[PDB]
Amino acid sequence: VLRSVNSREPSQVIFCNRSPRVVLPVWLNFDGEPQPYPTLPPGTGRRIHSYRGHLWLFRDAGTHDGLLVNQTELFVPSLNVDGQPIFANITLPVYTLKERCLQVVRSLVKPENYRRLDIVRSLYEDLEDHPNVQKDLERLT
Amino acid sequence: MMYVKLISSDGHEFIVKREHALTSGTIKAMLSNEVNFREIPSHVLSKVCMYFTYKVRYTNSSTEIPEFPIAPEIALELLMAANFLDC
Amino acid sequence: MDVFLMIRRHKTTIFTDAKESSTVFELKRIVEGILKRPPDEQRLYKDDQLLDDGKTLGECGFTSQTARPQAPATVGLAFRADDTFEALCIEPFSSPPELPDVMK
Numbered sequence: 001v002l003r004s005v006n007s008r009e010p011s012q013v014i015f016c017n018r019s020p021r022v023v024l025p026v027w028l029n030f031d032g033e034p035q036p037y038p039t040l041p042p043g044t045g046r047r048i049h050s051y052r053g054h055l056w057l058f059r060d061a062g063t064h065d066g067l068l069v070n071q072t073e074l075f076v077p078s079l080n081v082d083g084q085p086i087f088a089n090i091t092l093p094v095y096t097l098k099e100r101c102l103q104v105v106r107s108l109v110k111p112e113n114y115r116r117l118d119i120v121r122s123l124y125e126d127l128e129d130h131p132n133v134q135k136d137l138e139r140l141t
Numbered sequence: 142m143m144y145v146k147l148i149s150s151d152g153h154e155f156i157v158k159r160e161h162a163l164t165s166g167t168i169k170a171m172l173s174n175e176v177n178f179r180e181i182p183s184h185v186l187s188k189v190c191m192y193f194t195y196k197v198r199y200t201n202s203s204t205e206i207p208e209f210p211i212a213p214e215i216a217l218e219l220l221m222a223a224n225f226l227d228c
Numbered sequence: 229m230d231v232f233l234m235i236r237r238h239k240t241t242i243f244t245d246a247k248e249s250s251t252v253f254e255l256k257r258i259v260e261g262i263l264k265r266p267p268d269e270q271r272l273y274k275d276d277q278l279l280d281d282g283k284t285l286g287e288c289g290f291t292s293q294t295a296r297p298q299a300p301a302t303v304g305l306a307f308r309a310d311d312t313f314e315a316l317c318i319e320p321f322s323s324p325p326e327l328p329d330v331m332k
């Protein structure tokens with residue numbers, strides 16, 4: 001369902017990383033498979049060549065945490081007006097306090113040791129169920 | 142302006158805007174103007190209050206969003222509070 | 229510009245915001261509405277320094293880029309009982325436990 005259209009009409013885009021994370025851009029190909037692209041360090045920008053009707057999302061490259069692009073989940077290049085590129089501003093969402101705590105705990109504890117933590121079973125599951133692009137695609141669908 | 146009082150297990154009294162506290166569905170239920178938390182100490186509940194302020198300020202803003210900071214030493218207890226408070 | 233504060237006395241902590249251009253006295257009026265004690269029975273402090281009513285929060289060092297939503301700045305508070313003012317006393321928050329082994 002979620003897949004790029006094969007339009008063939010060029011569209012130039014600036015990916016602008018306004019987050020403190022290393023960013024992984026992900027292009028959804030014509031069969032809906034996620035294809036990873038080169039990463040962007042915190043605060044950097046890249047001018048790239050994409051196409052009208054193509055679909056992109058953006059993740060923390062190390063943890064796969066979800067990020068926003070122009071305040072939403074998905075970015076679709078549009079028609080360039082007067083030769084100007086489209087800006088894709090990548091930012092942190094406001095995470096729930098729970099998800100933010102899970103991020104920090106996942107960054108300190110090796111996955112084998114999640115079970116050694118003194119917490120209710122359901123939080124062991126929450127830690128182990130770490131962010132992943134496929135799961136989000138199956139949701140969005 | 143309407144405030145409410147949130148009391149930690151060690152007796153610290155945190156006074157925050159009612160609107161901010163309603164970030165938590167659990168607190169909403171405990172109110173529906175003071176709530177005592179027998180399992181949440183002040184080094185955790187102070188951070189919870191700072192999260193309310195951060196969320197209200199930055200929800201629906203184009204102004205670049207900073208990372209919410211959490212010291213390693215408090216991360217596990219904070220996780221437990223967030224899960225109880227559903228926030 | 230908004231500044232984000234914790235006003236602290238003994239085991240009381242108020243979370244609120246104010247304008248950088250607002251005055252110390254105007255902050256006492258805010259404390260008056262919450263804790264029901266008039267400005268003339270309040271002393272406000274930045275660390276050990278007594279703040280003057282007519283100064284702005286910005287002049288006293290509370291700026292929008294240091295007094296942040298996720299990390300608010302602290303303003304001390306002392307009350308007058310009858311004749312004289314109590315000393316400034318702020319109770320510390322509890323101490324975190326030792327890091328578990330798997331988190332080291």
Ligand SMILES: Cc1ncsc1-c1ccc(CNC(=O)[C@@H]2C[C@@H](O)CN2C(=O)[C@@H](NC(=O)C2CCC2)C(C)(C)C)cc1
Nearest residue numbers: 007008009015025027037038039040046048049050051054
């Ligand atoms: C340097 C860089 N840093 C972070 S991302 C990035 C980067 C690096 C290289 C590119 C080159 N552009 C592409 O690959 C675009 C992006 C996406 O729209 C798909 N794509 C294509 O060129 C694709 N081509 C087309 O659709 C053409 C064939 C009909 C029009 C592809 C992968 C089938 C050859 C784009 C971005």
